[PDB]
Design a protein around this ligand. Sequence first.
Ligand SMILES: *[C@@H]1O[C@H](CO)[C@@H](O[C@@H]2O[C@H](CO)[C@@H](O[C@@H]3O[C@H](CO)[C@@H](O)[C@H](O)[C@@H]3O)[C@H](O)[C@H]2NC(C)=O)[C@H](O)[C@H]1NC(C)=O
Ligand SMILES: *[C@@H]1O[C@H](CO)[C@@H](O[C@@H]2O[C@H](CO)[C@@H](O)[C@H](O)[C@H]2NC(C)=O)[C@H](O)[C@H]1NC(C)=O
Ligand code: NAG
Ligand code: NAG
Ligand code: NAG
Ligand code: NAG
Ligand code: NAG
Lengths: 109, 147, 303, 293
Amino acid sequence: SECCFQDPPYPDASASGPRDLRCYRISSDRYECSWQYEGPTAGVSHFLRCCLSSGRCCYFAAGSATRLQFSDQAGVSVLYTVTLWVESWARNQTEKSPEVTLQLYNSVK
Amino acid sequence: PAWTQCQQLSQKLCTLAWSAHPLVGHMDLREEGDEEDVPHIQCGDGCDPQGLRDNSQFCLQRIHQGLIFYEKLLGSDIFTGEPSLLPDSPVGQLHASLLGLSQLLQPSPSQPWQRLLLRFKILRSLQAFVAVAARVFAHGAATLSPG
Amino acid sequence: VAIWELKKDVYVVELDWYPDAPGEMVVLTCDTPEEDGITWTLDQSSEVLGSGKTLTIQVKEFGDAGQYTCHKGGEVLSHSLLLLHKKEDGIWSTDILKDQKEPKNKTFLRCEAKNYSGRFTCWWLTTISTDLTFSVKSSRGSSDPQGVTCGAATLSAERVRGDNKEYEYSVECQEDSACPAAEESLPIEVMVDAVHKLKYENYTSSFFIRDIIKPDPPKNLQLKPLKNSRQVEVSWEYPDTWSTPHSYFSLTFCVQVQGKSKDRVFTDKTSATVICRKNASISVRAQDRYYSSSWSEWASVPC
Amino acid sequence: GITNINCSGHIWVEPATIFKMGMNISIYCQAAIKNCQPRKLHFYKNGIKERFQITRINKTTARLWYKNFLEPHASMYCTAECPKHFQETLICGKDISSGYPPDIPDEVTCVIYEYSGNMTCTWNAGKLTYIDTKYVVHVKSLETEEEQQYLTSSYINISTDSLQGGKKYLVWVQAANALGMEESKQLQIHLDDIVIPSAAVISRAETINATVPKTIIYWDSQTTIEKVSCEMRYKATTNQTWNVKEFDTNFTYVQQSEFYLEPNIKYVFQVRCQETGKRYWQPWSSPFFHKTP
Ligand SMILES: *[C@@H]1O[C@H](CO)[C@@H](O[C@@H]2O[C@H](CO)[C@@H](O[C@@H]3O[C@H](CO)[C@@H](O)[C@H](O)[C@@H]3O)[C@H](O)[C@H]2NC(C)=O)[C@H](O)[C@H]1NC(C)=O
Ligand SMILES: *[C@@H]1O[C@H](CO)[C@@H](O[C@@H]2O[C@H](CO)[C@@H](O)[C@H](O)[C@H]2NC(C)=O)[C@H](O)[C@H]1NC(C)=O
Ligand SMILES: *[C@@H]1O[C@H](CO)[C@@H](O)[C@H](O)[C@H]1NC(C)=O
Ligand SMILES: *[C@@H]1O[C@H](CO)[C@@H](O)[C@H](O)[C@H]1NC(C)=O
Ligand SMILES: *[C@@H]1O[C@H](CO)[C@@H](O)[C@H](O)[C@H]1NC(C)=O
Ligand SMILES: *[C@@H]1O[C@H](CO)[C@@H](O)[C@H](O)[C@H]1NC(C)=O
Ligand SMILES: *[C@@H]1O[C@H](CO)[C@@H](O)[C@H](O)[C@H]1NC(C)=O
């Protein structure tokens, strides 16, 4: 998995959506991100977006999966603070999860 | 002829050498003395199979020097002081088998804790020497003995 | 601490890795004899901040590494590839290779030799398959090193573990002037450079040839009955890959009886007598006779 | 190199490398490898790696703790795991000893066996020391006040030829080991009063078939001393009491002691003698059995 730094294929914009985004450091250089979705999972595509310190922002295409892993060379910085959230496009409009921002390196647990 | 006695006693030596110290390779520790003196079977010392067919005198000159060199150490305080090495212990028999075999060819301070580590170093370095020595005797008794 | 050149126009920068690190500022210079309006373009990047003959960017993440290019007047003068060497609390990173656990912990490089001829094969493991490059160089001794020529690292095996695939790489090396009969004093030094995308790491391993020797399994294993007491005479031969002659490079064998349930005898001869049972299998290993190196693999036959 | 250890660090013990037996001890190992921050630090006791009570207090220093260390000797050495080496890196080692401080020597006694020509001084050393304990015997003349000292590990024979200044002397003993040092009370001697005659031995035991059965005991000694008193003990082995007779014997001739005893019982006989009036006696002779007719 590699972070694409272009725009997601939907317009930016309901109460239903994903929630409870949790990311830790699972290995010496690999990471894992888990979230949950409130609603039917038919046709739902999740996309984990991340913004670096320079202001540049990228996204991960998670597909139908509600869990995504990535290495330390996918474009997401781990030594400095980033901004994470999950966007889901099922039908009609876009759905978002609560915001979670932290330094990924010291998330060892 | 005389090659058979050197072959049988060297066979016992390789048994006694490893029997005295069955430690595996990863157990051996290393110390900051990377830089190099101790007699080794150098390349071209005539101990290869072709060297013995050409002239076995060259290889025995180095093996003889090594057997009296390692014998000099089993007689040193390293192998006699505290902690006492038992004479009938498999390490003790190595001394006499070293001198006896050495005879057939051509008729210092230390503290009790350092000796344990030193004794380990000598035995391992000796094992590689006795190995190649038992090879030239096995080859000699199988090729030059019948004639 | 410092920076060093790996090969032509390829550099590795050492970086202490901890959170909120300042990184290490890096001074890059274009290989231009004279210019007053130099812009800098990193690979594809359209955004261009580079100015002047020298560009300094604060290297503090992988995003600052890659191929930096400086082209004057629409013509490319030279390139420059930057790799990162991750230092973490005084420990060099070891993410590319896998811990082999054999024979002890943290044994990333493992090497075997089928004989004393001076040819050996070192192998490693990794959990990735793409953007991977290895570089192996070796010699005997460090002070006045002797010549050792190594081939190319190639994929040899690919298996499955719990949830991912495990990739096995290997390289063939040959000592230029090998002395099999000699008692080794200076060890063989194997140095492997590894680059995954923009991440660089290096490994090392020291050994004597006599300590990494693992003969090939016995050759032509067969059985034949004995009418007196229905005992079996097992017969085998030395493996072809073993050193020659056999009157000098002797071996010792181990014969055991296994019968689909739950018998070992050692000998220096090339035959032995055992007792067979129902659906039992006889197997034999091999080891150097005068030096306790590694055992060979099993060669088995049914009763 | 090959004939010597090259320590790459140092090791120290608290309270000390030599300590009182049964105490808690802490062994500290500090590494000093040129280009290696150790991943792990191991301890070996008598070549056996230790697995418990080891704490990584410092990235380069480790502490091994023992509760109630009872071994009198032990060879310690510690190593380091270095990332650039497949071998464990030797740090340093040290021999530790355990024992007890010496007691105050008492029961100091100095005698001169007659023809031995030298004076034998002994004492009670006290508790077991387990460690190398040395003893210094001081001899001072009550006349010329000059003091000689003598080192030993057990007891000592001092030649009478070295006892020139007078016949009256003071003797005390000093005991010392790594853990302590003590001194005895002064004992004064008179070289004429501390002589013990040469050994007296029993020869035979004869019984006579006459009016009353006489058990004649033959015994003798080769002593030049004139005034000599002796004692002899005799008991039936079935009995548990000692009967004794005293004699002022003249060893020019073999002595004959006439005893009137009961027939057909086992008996035991022992003798000891001294210069009359002097302080010290002989030890009791070896038991001499004799059944009567
Ligand atoms: C290679 O390195 C690993 C590093 O983890 C070694 O693992 C060691 O495993 C033991 C046993 O799990 C750990 O000690 C014990 O842990 C168990 C719970 O698993 C517990 O019951 C005990 O009280 C004790 O804590 C040990 O901590 C661990 N090593 C380290 C450095 O933490 C492994 O043994 C090494 N060897 C090989 C051949 O892989
Ligand atoms: C001090 O002298 C005495 C004799 O007066 C020694 O006693 C004997 O010495 C001989 C050797 O000369 C030994 O074979 C005996 O075993 C000793 N004991 C006896 C009971 O005869 C004594 O050895 C001398 N002191 C020391 C410390 O040896
Ligand atoms: C191995 O990598 C380290 C990390 O920067 C580097 O300093 C060192 O030079 C490399 N090894 C050698 C033998 O140069
Ligand atoms: C050693 O320490 C333990 C507790 O740490 C204590 O119970 C014991 O009395 C100590 N022994 C000595 C001799 O100090
Ligand atoms: C512990 O390590 C520090 C380095 O951070 C050093 O200054 C200190 O002397 C060490 N202490 C001991 C007891 O070795
Ligand atoms: C005197 O002491 C010495 C000390 O060696 C001893 O050997 C000897 O038996 C003693 N008696 C003599 C010399 O009459
Ligand atoms: C045992 O010895 C005591 C002490 O002299 C003596 O009185 C007693 O009679 C003895 N026993 C016999 C049975 O004679």
